[PDB]
UniProtKB/Swiss-Prot annotation:
This is Cellular tumor antigen p53. Changing V52I: In sporadic cancers; somatic mutation. The chain holds residues 96 to 291 of 393 of the full protein. The N-terminal and C-terminal disordered regions undergo liquid-liquid phase separation (LLPS) following homotetramerization and activation. Post-translational modifications, such as phosphorylation or lactylation affect the ability to undergo LLPS. The nuclear export signal acts as a transcriptional repression domain. The TADI and TADII motifs (residues 17 to 25 and 48 to 56) correspond both to 9aaTAD motifs which are transactivation domains present in a large number of yeast and animal transcription factors. Changing P56H: In sporadic cancers; somatic mutation.
Length: 196
């Protein structure tokens, strides 16, 4: 089955936010609002903001999952390729098969769904650091979009869900991802293709 990707702010007014990192050739992570698409280098830090209008209950969690964007591929589980799943770049918590990791959160949990076989990573939803207006999660993507035997050039979406302590839906947002060598150039290219 295919998880829903419908944007849903829910009772707490949940939505994501992204930094404005620009498109210099050296940039390692950059988000395009026009494309709703994050471009990032392999295994590099991707800051994703969580914004709410009101405080969700203690025990609320935030889950990330990848799916293929194209209709003809949506039913296939997104996983790391046969090379990367074996490169022993473990952080001690993430299964080596999982495309999406949360970086630097000891409370991260990784799920292999018993029915759909899909992978996800979930962390507690926490209030912002003192002085801040939103909470930031740092994600890593552990294969290139081009990895043979993995994503194999097929575009993916990351779905972020706000969940209660039982796993029930409280909110949902999503964005496309391209993991590539030169996120700055690729964002510029794709934005120009869109303008054309
Ligand atoms: C005054 C401005 N107004 C927005 C208009 C508020 C700003 C303050 N924020 C608080 C806030 C809580 C949370 C959370 C949580 C669950 O854990 C809890 C742990 C302990 C206690 C409660 C919850 C996540 C986020 I992201 C977040 O912004 C809520 C919105
Ligand atoms: Zn790979």
């Amino acid at each position: 089955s295919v998880p829903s990707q419908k944007t849903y702010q829910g009772s707490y007014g949940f939505r994501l936010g992204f930094l404005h990192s620009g498109t210099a050739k050296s940039v390692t992570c950059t988000y395009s609002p026009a494309l709703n698409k994050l471009f990032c280098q392999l295994a590099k830090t991707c800051p994703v903001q969580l914004w709410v209008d009101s405080t969700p209950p203690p025990g609320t969690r935030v889950r990330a999952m990848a799916i293929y964007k194209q209709s003809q591929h949506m039913t296939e589980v997104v996983r790391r390729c046969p090379h990367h799943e074996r490169c022993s770049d473990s952080d001690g918590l993430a299964p080596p098969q999982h495309l999406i990791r949360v970086e630097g959160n000891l409370r991260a949990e990784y799920l292999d769904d018993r029915n759909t076989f899909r992978h996800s990573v979930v962390v507690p939803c926490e209030p912002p650091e003192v002085g801040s207006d939103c909470t930031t999660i740092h994600y890593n993507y552990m294969c290139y979009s081009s990895c043979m035997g993995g994503m194999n050039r097929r575009p993916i979406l990351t779905i972020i869900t706000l969940e209660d302590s039982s796993g029930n839906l409280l909110g949902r947002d999503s964005f496309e991802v391209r993991v590539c060598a030169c996120p700055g150039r690729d964002r510029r290219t794709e934005e120009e293709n869109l303008r054309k």
